[PDB]
Amino acid sequence: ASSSFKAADLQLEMTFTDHMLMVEWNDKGWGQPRIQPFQNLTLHPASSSLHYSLQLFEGMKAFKGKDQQVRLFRPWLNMDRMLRSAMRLCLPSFDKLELLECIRRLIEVDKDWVPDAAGTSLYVRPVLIGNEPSLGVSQPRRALLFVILCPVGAYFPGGSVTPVSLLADPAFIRAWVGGVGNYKLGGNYGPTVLVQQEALKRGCEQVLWLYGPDHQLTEVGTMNIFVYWTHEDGVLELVTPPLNGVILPGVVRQSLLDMAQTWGEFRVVERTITMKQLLRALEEGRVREVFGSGTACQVCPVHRILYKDRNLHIPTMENGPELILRFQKELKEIQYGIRAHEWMFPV
Amino acid sequence: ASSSFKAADLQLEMTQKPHKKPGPGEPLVFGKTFTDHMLMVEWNDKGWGQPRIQPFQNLTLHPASSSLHYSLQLFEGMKAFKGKDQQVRLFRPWLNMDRMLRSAMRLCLPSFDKLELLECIRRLIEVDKDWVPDAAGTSLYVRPVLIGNEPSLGVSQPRRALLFVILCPVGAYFPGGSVTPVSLLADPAFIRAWVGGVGNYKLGGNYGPTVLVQQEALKRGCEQVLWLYGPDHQLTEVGTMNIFVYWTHEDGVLELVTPPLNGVILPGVVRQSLLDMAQTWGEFRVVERTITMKQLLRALEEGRVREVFGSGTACQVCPVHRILYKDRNLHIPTMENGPELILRFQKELKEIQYGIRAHEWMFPV
Ligand SMILES: *Cc1c(COP(=O)(O)O)cnc(C)c1O
């Protein structure tokens, strides 16, 4: 009472998994967390979740190693992000480690659902919605937190790393400074459906999100973007856009920056990336690799960019892709328990 | 893009046990009290289903519903008014219907026939007619919603959707017919929408992020938010209302100005009505042009501002008396100037809406 829900108070009642977590918030505080069979949600028609998008989510993977032990990849970063998203849309705060322990217990009940094939895992989807039975745009004192799980079977059609189809049109904007693009809110995704369809009929599989008067490369679909090149100063570097408001702080993004910094072989920085710099670098043969990063596709190569209906080839595949494969191998090693690391949380 | 549901295919299920009526003398909070019935229509792979109109009940949604994860949701807001002869009427519902599937087209929900939904809503209000209040400035708020209902976690076009309409009786925004002003926080750090964005559609996603800014307006002691856009600080919206400025322009001409529909402005029904009304009078210049803080600041020190107001069916016309910008107070002359134009707009809209003056803008139920 008077604070957050506790995993020690959990209520147990024994393509998605068999069970789900559910926690309710109402004025005075949180109710106890419930692990119950997968079932439909019953919401009032005036629920603020459906009218004013008082909704946020998270996305992380649970990996089954060779020793058959299930582990979550840096879940503390997902919990940090979830709480920041909650504060912004201006829902109840909760204790990050209590939600983690509740999710741990949920994955434990559905442990048989975690796949062990190469490139497979269990997708954990936590959600927090406003559940106020009112049409007023306000702080929603009733709320609902739920977690659902689902097995995912390899991103790539086989085991071969395949490059993806980008469209770069300045008329479409995902996020803005002073906006809400740095939080995983449902509201940022709905508007992308029409843009993705526009990309598909223009011969592209995904969208390269441009921002500002100087056409800054921000995100690749629902992934962060990275460019491995020799910059205009002659130094070999790995660059990704900074957290200035328009970028979603990805867990894989942070991990790639952390790993590359530890190696100390090349410069690793956060510095926006304009189409002017990319066009110049391509023409000068300074670009090595360009990729997207995210939970779905850990490291995802890009081979051409349709900018103002262009056919700009990105030489990612003819440069190995050396860094992508190194990142993929080291991540697989950490995630599937082949090497012990502080980044993994055992379930 | 697969036609529509028909009003002729609408069945009916009356309530077994009705909700409690508030009563003409007890406090009505906006959007917390609901009527006995609701409209609901489902869409899937075969197309649209039949409506029917059922008792007020909770929605049953799959946990992976795209409405809850990726905000595939939109809404409308219009009012039904009851005159002192018991006749119920809707204010320009065709425009709300026009604002509907444009919103659905955007994120990327099924199309429907505007007149078929209008007939279904008309019938729903007729069923719950006893819920429409009588008192001075009271009304029934009508809330149509269309959501994506896909049972998967992919960010894609839903193969399943749900359209529903709920009703709620609301009190007068201004008691006694006497308009009162609001103060606004103008902080450029928070942006509601951007060009190439989705602020020109009534989608749920544009509202959630405004809750924190509204709370920051409250803490800084200011009656609602003034939404600034760009490095030039363009005045765009007043909370969930369109903005209008009545002043003598820099060129020396008396005018009524409101921002143009360039992508950051929601095309309000009241906004369009005020423009239509002002143009029909032909007493002053009516123009759609960007308004900046620099222009407002210059007009204020030169004494050229007469009235500044917000527009949009909860309030119709809402006066603004103060704007907190750059930690400094800007006293807006709205109130000392009558407020003449606001009172004229309010009287005209009140007379049209409650049927005291007949107009083609009103749709009978
Ligand atoms: C989820 C997401 C990412 C990547 O985040 P990860 O935590 O690394 O999965 C990047 N950009 C957007 C827009 C996202 O939604």
Ligand SMILES: *Cc1c(COP(=O)(O)O)cnc(C)c1O
């Ligand atoms: C609803 C709304 C308006 C006003 O629209 P009306 O149709 O006149 O009710 C204006 N701005 C915003 C941001 C709105 O949501």
